[PDB]
């Protein structure tokens, strides 16, 4: 079908976001593995895979709506140097993705594009209930047990 | 994630009402078991378990939204004396709770809280399936009579 | 069987306290889950399920004794802000509820209500096993520290 | 194979009537489900599925005979308000449709269309087994009463 | 539950269109089977089964909302003569039916009928997956030609 | 039992038809195999086997009716030279068999020989719903995809 | 260990190449799926996954060599508009990756960094024996059977 032009633009911005998330989670997972923190490596790598799944869904939706997916553009990556910084950068970036997803869900509701709305609602449900919540839990655990105890659990 | 205060208030009110529903459904299920109406026991018990899951989800959502779940308050319980009265009380409570859920879904949409809205929509579909079941039971009492209807509830399966 | 009014009153008061325990334990379990302390979640959730079974048995006993179960009233909930405070609130509630159970067992014996007494003795052994667990947790916090203790609760198994 | 125009017309008319039967049986099955009469739901639904298979076979036969299946036309639906009226409407439709099938079998024999006749004879045996079931239900309502009969339809199995 | 008259009217109109879709898809599936195009048969048949489930859900929703399902009316069927024309007719009907579904979802949201809206959103995602499939088929005919495309439909799997 | 004389004659003509069908389907299946068209070979060979089953049923019925089955007589075979011609010859011959079966079913109805009627009705149901329909589908497919695409599917 | 500075630069250029390959194969696989060409979609998606595996190996090697992986930079993507153009763009880009891999293997041999040499040799073996060869076969098949027959096999 012929999708709304604004809906395709917003879907393409969400795609740029998901692809940047994939890159950041990829390099962070491998920085965790380089440090022997295999549990964080595995968690962040699976989150990069989920970002790849979200990007696949967005690309499929943009192509179905007869748009041109933009997989070339990338947002600036915020790579941390230590575990707390990388977790806080992942959290900042999940917050930005959730905000942008909410804006696009509102737009899809105004533009009557309900099916894009539920695709983005599944994406927002993953962003909130899968990894924003996990990151907040991790930062709270660092606050409770300390960073050295927290990192000991991640090996 | 810091949620909207209005959305957290609505979720806490839906939580109060879900807890009241749990209590009323369990009291009614055990009043049915006490009378030997076993299939009515089973239905009301699985419905109380279902509202139990609903309250669990609302508590988890209010906690994720950095709010304080209010498990202390409960609404007034409508406990019937006989089967028809208990089913009518359950019906009235489902209807009130559905009105509440619709108001909360409207507010969640107005605040762009879309996962709160998805949560409340699952609770709405469940509550409205139970509304369907209660209306079916009332029609069955009108069709077969109360003595025939109650005879069908003696055996749980 | 028509039960003694005093025994039904005591059972209804133990029921109020069991329901308050269910609510407090579930709120605490979900506060623990929200913090990533999963083994504490699991313990507090199975304890809330256990007090759930206790309340079920008390409701069934009050109904068998031709009384009216009071699921409407709840006691004040002691909700802590951090793990130690939540464990202390749970401890205080278990201790109050054990005192109540002992008074009710004494009264049930004085009224020759021996199956009510057997019921309350099962509730007593369960509540006092959880008292043992809470005291163990306090000793473990004193032994390994709160940061080491909380680190042991991150993984549910 | 180029079929006789009269045989294709008769098959198209039996098809119109089979489609009308599908629609009426499904509406009645879902009206029964809405009232909690689950075994009546199940019977009317499997009967609508059966007329669905019949319409499929008639469409395939009209297509093989190089005719044009007419799925656009439907007959007037007789939708009842209560169980007895719905069963009587189903009975009337089965009887009309059996008369139609007999006329079509006679014509198919007169035109030496013997596989059309075999098709229509399978449809006839099925429709007349459902006629038997509907007459059984009417006799059961006359024997046990409508309230007892409807009580037997509450549980699907 | 007594539903809004506008929502019941929209659901009845979506039901008319779902029934028209069932009929058109089944006629097209059997026209495809008659030509030996078996994979096209299979697709159009499973699509007619899918619109069958959709009509079932709409009937159940209109009945729950204390409305009268209208299974009597059907829209005009667009029956093609060849594969491309049949696929274009299916495309046109899916597009009209998607416009209708979007209008009905808008109205259901305006009336706070959120479970009607969830129902219609499932129907929308299904219809729009079939729209995707039909557009894929048109692109494949443009890419490989109609003779190569039809050759790929000879075998059902 | 003692069958009607006309019913046995008509059953014997149907037997001649089924045996000629068997021979024609046999040589056509093997001409398809000689050309590498294994799907047509297998289909036409199974149809020759079904003709053998029909001939067995007819011979059993003629012997039960105390007649003498005529397995010696054979109708003229119409062997094609290319795939379309062999399919059209099989279709012409299925049409002739169906016509002759209808005549004999009418005769069995007039002669009260109902059991021969249902034997021949099963034969007519196979002739129509098993291979006349298949041949018409095949010729329509040749018309739709072309002969070179059609033959490609038959390898 | 402390890797050679030139070896880390060359590994980072190979990483940019692998990440651009991933993006291009991703959008091409989804453009194939949008057109109903599911066999090309699946093949090109699995090749995007293999590019992700190669990029993971390169990032792990750069981190082990105490370098900073550059997952932010991306080369220009060459997205085709029709199947032949996308296959030719994938082939051009595989050729460029193989050339650059050979240069870096030579450099790793000069810099005595043998282990990076075998990592890149496995990457070059995949690039040649897994998808450059496949793309050349696909273009030869398009030349032999034609584009409409070739695309028919890819559905
Ligand atoms: C009068 C108060 C309550 C009673 C008597 C009660 C009783 C029960 C019982 C007997 C079970 C099944 C236990 C088992 O067989 O393992 C159960 C399950 C459960 N309850 Fe409650 N409950 C009450 C209130 C609550 C509340 C307030 C919540 C949450 C806020 C809750 C959450 C749950 C959950 C999540 C389950 C698991 C669902 C399942 O059984 O599959 N309950 N309850
Ligand atoms: C031309 C008209 C129709 C034809 C030829 C047709 C044919 C069929 C067939 C062959 C089946 C599968 C039966 C089986 O294998 O058990 C089926 C299923 C079904 N039909 Fe229809 N049908 C028609 C119209 C309708 C209508 C109008 C409705 C409802 C308003 C409906 C409701 C259903 C349902 C609920 C199912 C079950 C879904 C399933 O198979 O899992 N059908 N139909
Ligand atoms: Na009875
Ligand atoms: Na071809």
Author numbering:
A (entry chain B), F (entry chain H), G (entry chain A): 1 to 155
B (entry chain N), C (entry chain M), D (entry chain V), E (entry chain U): 1 to 157
What does the paper say about this structure?
Iron‐storage bacterioferritins (Bfrs), existing in either homo‐ or hetero‐multimeric form, play a crucial role in iron homeostasis. Unlike single‐subunit bacterial Ftn, Bfr can exist as a homo‐ or hetero‐complex, which assembles from two distinct subunits in a 1:1 ratio. The interior of the four‐helix bundle contains a ferroxidase center (FC), which catalyzes oxidation of Fe2+ to Fe3+. Here, the cryo‐EM structure and functional characterization of a bacterial hetero‐Bfr (SoBfr12) are reported.
